[PDB]
Every structure is written in C-alpha cells, then in structure tokens.
C-alpha cells in the first residue's frame, strides 16, 4: 500500500534545479532521507502518514523554499497541508 511520490526541485523557469540539500521527514520528525538535488525527479514510495519535504540548503543564487507538508491517506491519494 505504498504510494509513489515524485518530487521535483525546480527554478522559476520550471527547470529541474541541482544543488539543493533536501530532507524528507515523517510526522514524528524522523529524517527518512537526505539528498542533494541533481537535476532529475526524485521518487519515493510512502505509506499513509504525514510527511514534510524540507530544504536545508539552497544553491548559491537561490532562496530556500518554504517546507512542504503533505499527507498520504489510507486510499493511496495525496493531499497538501
């Protein structure tokens, strides 16, 4: 019952942006994964629960984005909080 989630880190022209340090956290606060963006979509598979994508560092010339909180529900659908 794991739901596929596609994460894109982009610039304002809508192109994939490399160089951003990112964490995905669950509702407890547990860091599920930490990576640096590399210019492609990042795929995760997540069970029901509430999670947060957090930008911990932005590449030079770029501003740190506000964290994105989302929920995957028991029906497999995803919602942004």
């Amino acid at each position: 019952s794991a739901t596929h989630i596609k994460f894109s880190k982009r610039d304002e022209d809508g192109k994939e942006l490399a160089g951003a340090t990112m964490e995905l956290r669950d509702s407890s606060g547990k860091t599920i994964s930490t990576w640096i963006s590399d210019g492609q979509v990042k795929d995760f598979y997540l069970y029901p629960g509430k999670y947060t994508f957090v930008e911990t560092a932005a590449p030079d010339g770029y501003e740190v984005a506000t964290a994105i909180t989302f929920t995957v529900n028991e029906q497999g659908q995803v919602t942004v909080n």
Partner: peptide
C-alpha cells in the same frame, strides 16, 4: 503523485 518545490532567485 507530484510534489513540486521551487527555489526562487535571489535579487541583485
């Protein structure tokens, strides 16, 4: 599902 996060440009 798609999550899209944009990094805005800094000014100058």
């Amino acid at each position: 599902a798609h999550i899209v996060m944009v990094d805005a440009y800094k000014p100058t």
